[PDB]
Amino acid sequence: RLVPSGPNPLHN
């Protein structure tokens, strides 16, 4: 959860 991408995109 660091960026709007990947799993749990930043805030999810």
UniProtKB/Swiss-Prot annotation:
<feature type="modified residue" description="Hydroxyproline">
    <location>
        <position position="7"/>
    </location>
</feature>
<comment type="function">
    <text>Extracellular signal peptide that regulates cell fate. Represses root apical meristem maintenance. Regulates the transition of protophloem cells from proliferation to differentiation, thus impinging on postembryonic growth capacity of the root meristem; this signaling pathway requires CRN and CLV2.</text>
</comment>
<feature type="glycosylation site" description="O-linked (Ara...) hydroxyproline">
    <location>
        <position position="7"/>
    </location>
</feature>
<feature type="modified residue" description="Hydroxyproline">
    <location>
        <position position="4"/>
    </location>
</feature>
<protein>
    <recommendedName>
        <fullName>CLE10p</fullName>
    </recommendedName>
</protein>
